[PDB]
Amino acid sequence: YKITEDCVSCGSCASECPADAISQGDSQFVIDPEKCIECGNCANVCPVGAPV
Template structure:
């Protein structure tokens, strides 16, 4: 599953720099996660870094984006390959 940031977000700015895929950005009111860039840190870390640093625990798994570890690893490979080409 991709992750999502709920309305409980306090805009503390700690999650955005922790994302190795640059999937987190400021939305109209709170931070948002681009599900096409989110790998839950698969390929980078053992656990999602945004969840680890969030002081209000407002970053659950998105129940509307059921994804296996294999799908997340494939996305990681695509994203890192694109960075090497750029």
């Protein structure tokens, strides 16, 4: 899963992430590909649908 610039940094995906791959960065939250279990729960928990 990969996050996009559409992210407004609401922090919902970060915590919801089972594997905790998602971390806050310089301009938006980011997804670590190596530890992402491809569940897609972050996409579900997003008011703007940034995680793709």
